[PDB]
């Protein structure tokens, strides 16, 4: 294939009016990349520089090759690296690199950008292997003072992409850091005339920070770099400042340990000074800097709480600076928007920062904030009163109970009075502030003196502007959550009134500013905390939601706009969520209405556009099944088609909820579940084997295996091997990336494996010969639990895992598995779980059981 033919393929792939020709071209391109990668890469690089080719085809050439060289998936990354190294000949490599460098200095910025990304991908492969030594010399020379602007900027882009494209948790660019910094800082320093170049340099520097540890450990280099960054924060151009402050914040987060001299000698004074800028963007920059400091010092405190002997040390920047920083933040609170728009601004950032200060510094925040509140809560300007309640609410988390209780008692009359303020913004924030008081120190509201006035303010507010009503629903949730646990609880005396008020807000005609949905959410809370003493109010909710569902189903949807229809769907979702909670909370009350409910649910399922609410319908059907037990069997024939269709819609979230139905009936049908188990297993085996399955399906299915095994017991043995294979495969799957999303997903998978093993060990309690060949596998998983804090720090996870240690031990008194019970990590894990006081007492009891059984195992 020639350059011209390849270019024609690319062009046709994106520009042909004929979709057939587009797909044919894409297939032929991928096929050449598979059959002759050397030629594919060479030709791609030649089209990149071919002026005779349309711009989009040249950009596409570069980006497609780039996407065959780097990936997010680490495994794909490694495969691409080895393919470049072994399958592209040295002469081909040299030609591709030369062509990419030619395109980098193109007068067309789109060509230059694509070329920069391609250069970055190749560099990410070669520099860690001590290759392409010419590149960094070219980059350093290219950002030299007398180079033209486009060459500087394109090269700085390439350096940024280089650092961003490398794995964050890697040493791939360490060996190049010196030259990277030279090239980057050359563009960042004050002598550089182009704002675009300084911006690109600072953004690249931010990208590079994770690769310059060795440089930051050198005092002279660290000093010079920090000097350049600070110089940039004082630059005249506001975008340059913004970029430099991004750098400063990232440096503080990554290299906190080195910041004390820079804080003392300059940054404290500088950032405090600019926090008073009349420009909201500048001030916002300084605010973000101090929020970063607070976040890091809170994280240090947390880590030292988990391990008192960790080397990390806080310098207490925030604590020492409160006197000088906090008054400026408070002043920023009066820069709200003169309505309604709700768009973010510096005043909201300053509020979040103030809350970080209070969490980090406790009682030290009180004096300046309380002074501001006193000065402004009765001011004539609505901005000052709103700022006052914002500040007061923002210090309710951090200080000790004595101080908070004292000042809540002192301020509650004025705060409740602000619920009658003429300013909508003031009332909105006042309702929020009452929620903050309730949420952190609910006992601060004296049951006789102020709780009736608090409840009354919430009830009036639910009838106010929807913005106020939403915050009143949130506040009611906080009140119930924080007061229900006390015995007696005062909040139950107000349950009828509260419920009545919430029903009224749920009966709003619209959901403007989320006031109606929020009310439904609070109703769910009311249900979940209801006691027998307020049984009647529970009944009131049940009656309301059932009737309400009926009402929504009288609405002719062919007279609705798209927006109208979305509103109706969200309302039906709110209703069905509360209804599911009602059904689960009082199973005895459900039988008489079961038929009617299913009649409605099937109707909802047969509606056109049922795909939008079918998830919530399945949640309610599952709750009804759980509550009726064997009484649900009469609906199974009619429900089966829907269930199977939902289970097979592996792309849609409805399949997850359908798995949740299986989980419910496995528990609620008792003996009667066995007659369906085989069919369920078959379906599930297909589902988890479907490549079109969304990721969230995998953990759900794993967990439900545990449910099934738990209820069918020995009937599970013929499936055991297959299921164990799945569990093993799942527990040995590394995170896809180092990103937070991949690690969190992996945690979900491991949690589901824990569910599976718990259910299996419970089900096979009497069949140790069936479990025996998997004990070591289970112990490998448990070791994973003991190693990763995202697992063992969770009370329920540790309770289940240490429970497995004990129960498995109890199943084998023959000593056939005693070899696992002498391991230091097992003993240590049992002891950490038994002693850690943030673990509940049920967890510690389970750890005791595990310790008894482990010691007995060593006795054998």
């Amino acid at each position: 294939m020639s350059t011209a033919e390849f270019a024609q393929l690319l062009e046709n792939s994106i520009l042909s009016p004929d979709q057939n020709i587009r797909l044919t071209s894409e297939t032929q391109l991928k096929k050449l990349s598979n059959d002759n990668f050397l030629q594919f890469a060479g030709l791609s690089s030649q089209v990149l520089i071919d002026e005779n080719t349309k711009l989009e085809g040249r950009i596409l050439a570069a980006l497609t090759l780039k996407n065959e060289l780097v990936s997010k998936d680490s495994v794909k990354t490694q495969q691409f690296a080895q393919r470049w190294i072994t399958q592209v000949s040295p002469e081909a490599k040299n030609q591709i690199k030369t062509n990419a460098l030619t395109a980098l200095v193109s007068i067309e910025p789109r060509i230059a950008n694509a070329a920069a990304q391609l250069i970055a991908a190749i560099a990410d492969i070669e520099l860690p292997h001590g290759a392409w030594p010419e590149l960094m010399k070219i980059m350093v020379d290219n950002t030299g003072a007398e180079q033209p602007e486009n060459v500087k900027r394109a090269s700085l882009l390439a350096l940024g992409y280089m650092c961003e494209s490398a794995d964050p948790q890697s040493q791939a660019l360490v060996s190049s850091s010196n030259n990277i910094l030279i090239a980057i800082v050359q563009g960042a320093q004050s002598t550089e005339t182009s704002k675009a170049v300084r911006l690109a340099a600072l953004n690249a520097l931010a990208d590079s920070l994770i690769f310059i540890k060795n440089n930051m450990e050198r005092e002279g280099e660290r000093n010079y770099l920090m000097q350049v960054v600070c110089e940039a924060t004082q630059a005249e151009d506001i975008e340059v400042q913004a970029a430099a402050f991004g750098c400063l914040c990232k440096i503080m987060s990554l290299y906190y340990t080195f910041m004390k001299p820079y804080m003392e000698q300059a940054l404290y004074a500088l950032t405090i000074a600019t926090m008073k800028s009349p420009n909201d963007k500048v001030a916002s920059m300084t605010v973000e800097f101090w929020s970063t400091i607070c976040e890091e010092e809170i994280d240090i405190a947390y880590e030292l709480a988990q391990f008192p002997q960790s080397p990390l040390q806080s310098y207490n920047f925030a604590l020492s600076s409160i006197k000088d920083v906090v008054p400026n933040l408070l002043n920023l609170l009066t820069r709200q928007n003169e309505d309604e728009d709700d768009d973010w601004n510096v005043s909201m950032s300053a509020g979040a920062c103030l809350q970080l200060f209070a969490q980090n510094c406790g009682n030290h925040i009180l004096e300046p904030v309380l002074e501001f509140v006193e000065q402004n809560i009765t001011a004539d300007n609505w901005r000052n009163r709103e700022a006052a309640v914002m500040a007061f609410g923002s210090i309710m988390d951090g200080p000790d109970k004595v101080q908070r209780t004292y000042y809540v008692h002192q301020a509650l009359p004025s705060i409740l009075n602000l619920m009658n303020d003429q300013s909508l913004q003031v009332k909105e924030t006042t309702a929020w502030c009452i929620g903050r008081i309730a949420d952190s120190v609910a006992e601060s509201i004296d049951p006789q003196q102020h709780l009736p006035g608090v409840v009354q303010a919430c009830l009036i507010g639910l009838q106010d502007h929807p913005k106020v009503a939403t915050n009143c629903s949130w506040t009611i949730i906080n009140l119930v959550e924080q007061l229900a646990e006390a015995t007696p609880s005062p909040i139950y005396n107000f349950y009828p009134a509260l419920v009545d008020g919430l029903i009224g807000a749920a009966n709003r005609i619209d959901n403007e500013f989320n006031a109606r949905a929020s009310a439904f959410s609070a109703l769910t809370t009311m249900v979940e905390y209801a006691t027998d003493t307020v049984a009647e109010t529970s009944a009131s909710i049940s009656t309301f939601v059932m009737d309400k569902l009926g009402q929504t189903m009288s609405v002719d949807e062919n007279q609705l706009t798209l927006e109208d229809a979305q509103s109706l769907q969200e309302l039906q979702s709110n209703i069905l969520t509360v209804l599911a909670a009602v059904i689960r909370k009082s199973p005895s009350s459900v039988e008489p209405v079961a038929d009617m409910l299913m009649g409605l649910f099937f109707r909802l399922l047969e509606k056109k556009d049922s795909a939008f609410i079918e998830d919530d319908v399945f949640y309610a059907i599952s709750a009804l099944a759980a509550s009726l037990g064997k009484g649900f069997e009469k609906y199974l024939e009619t429900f089966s088609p829907y269930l199977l269709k939902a289970l097979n819609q592996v792309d849609s979230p409805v399949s997850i909820t359908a798995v949740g139905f299986i989980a419910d009936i496995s528990n609620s049908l008792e003996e009667d579940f066995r007659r369906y188990s085989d069919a369920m297993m078959n379906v599930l085996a297909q589902m988890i084997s479907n490549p079109n399955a969304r990721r969230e399906l995998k953990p759900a299915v794993l967990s439900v295996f545990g449910d099934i095994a738990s209820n069918i017991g020995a009937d599970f043995i013929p499936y055991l091997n297959d299921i164990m294979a799945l569990c093993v495969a799942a527990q040995n799957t590394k995170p896809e990336n180092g990103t937070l999303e991949a690690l969190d997903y992996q945690i979900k998978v491991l949690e589901a494996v824990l569910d599976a093993y718990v259910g299996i060990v419970a089900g096979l309690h009497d069949k140790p010969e069936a479990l025996f060949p998997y004990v070591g596998t289970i112990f490998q998983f448990i070791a994973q639990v003991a190693e990763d804090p995202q697992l063992y720090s969770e009370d329920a996870t540790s309770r289940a895992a240490v429970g497995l240690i004990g129960d498995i031990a109890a199943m084998f008194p023959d000593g056939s598995i005693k070899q696992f019970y002498g391991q230091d990590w097992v003993i240590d894990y049992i002891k950490r779980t038994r002693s850690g006081q943030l673990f509940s007492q049920a967890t510690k009891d389970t750890a005791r059981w595990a310790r008894e059984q482990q010691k007995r195992q060593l006795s054998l």
């Binding site: 350093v140 800082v185 280099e221 010079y224 001299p261 003392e264 000698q265 300059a266 404290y268 207490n316």
Partner: peptide, 29 residues
């Protein structure tokens, strides 16, 4: 005195004076 004692007089010359990144980074000077 290993405590945070900031100055109200900022000075960002942590080391106008001429300075090259090439003379700093990797320079060991």
């Amino acid at each position: 005195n290993s405590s945070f004692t900031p100055s109200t007089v900022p000075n960002i010359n942590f080391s106008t004076n001429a300075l090259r990144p090439s003379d700093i980074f990797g320079a060991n000077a």
